[PDB]
Amino acid sequence: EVETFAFQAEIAQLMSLIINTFYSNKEIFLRELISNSSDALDKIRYESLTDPSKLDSGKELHINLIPNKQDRTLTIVDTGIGMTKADLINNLGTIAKSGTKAFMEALQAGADISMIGQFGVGFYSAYLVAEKVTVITKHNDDEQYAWESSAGGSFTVRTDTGEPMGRGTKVILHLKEDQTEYLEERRIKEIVKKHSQFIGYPITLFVE
Numbered sequence: 224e225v226e227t228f229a230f231q232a233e234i235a236q237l238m239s240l241i242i243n244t245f246y247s248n249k250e251i252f253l254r255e256l257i258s259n260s261s262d263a264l265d266k267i268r269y270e271s272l273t274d275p276s277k278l279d280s281g282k283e284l285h286i287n288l289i290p291n292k293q294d295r296t297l298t299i300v301d302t303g304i305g306m307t308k309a310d311l312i313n314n315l316g317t318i319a320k321s322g323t324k325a326f327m328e329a330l331q332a333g334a335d336i337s338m339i340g341q342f343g344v345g346f347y348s349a350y351l352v353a354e355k356v357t358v359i360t361k362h363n364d365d366e367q368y369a370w371e372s373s374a375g376g377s378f379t380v381r382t383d384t385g386e387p388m389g390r391g392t393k394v395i396l397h398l399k400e401d402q403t404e405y406l407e408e409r410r411i412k413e414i415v416k417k418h419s420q421f422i423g424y425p426i427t428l429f430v431e
């Protein structure tokens with residue numbers, strides 16, 4: 224059972240903008256994804272302070288970067304708050320309809336694509352390098368779900384019948400053929416050092 228949904232008009236627009244705008248500084252995608260993983264880890268950390276039973280799905284709060292040259296994928300895994308089916312469907316737990324306006328308005332007002340995060344829509348920068356994005360997620364108050372989109376104005380949601388995660392978000396980037404640099408160890412290492420050098424959680428770059 225696969226559910227297909229239309230993106231909200233503004234989000235669909237933002238996506239085609241990211242896919243069609245000639246913008247060479249694509250590496251900003253990683254900082255945006257790691258920053259979201261950090262935000263998700265801050266949410267579970269804060270919830271765990273009041274009630275410690277929130278960590279009964281995993282105590283480790285971390286970020287893993289998993290390149291795979293065989294499948295042409297870069298996976299960003301976090302052990303953060305995760306998303307419920309409703310969070311996942313609701314513009315991916317954000318005010319993305321509202322935030323898209325502010326960003327598209329700013330792009331006309333001098334600003335460039337690298338400022339996407341400042342409008343809370345940094346996730347869509349994944350489409351600067353990915354031809355398809357799969358988001359596997361698990362929240363404490365729901366089951367495991369897989370969200371997927373190759374853009375084109377729609378996304379799908381299904382329950383994931385794959386490997387249980389415990390809690391957190393797995394962002395699988397199915398990279399475009401000309402974007403395989405983001406699978407190279409030295410290239411990832413350089414991006415993390417340049418943009419994510421002060422994240423408050425361990426970032427592990429897996430080797431092949």
Ligand SMILES: Oc1ccc(-c2ccnn2-c2ccccc2Cl)c(O)c1
Nearest residue numbers: 256259260262263305315316392394
């Ligand atoms: O790449 C991602 C994308 C999304 C999430 C995520 C899980 C729970 N909330 N969110 C979320 C959603 C939209 C904006 C910011 C955040 Cl933190 C993540 O942890 C990594």
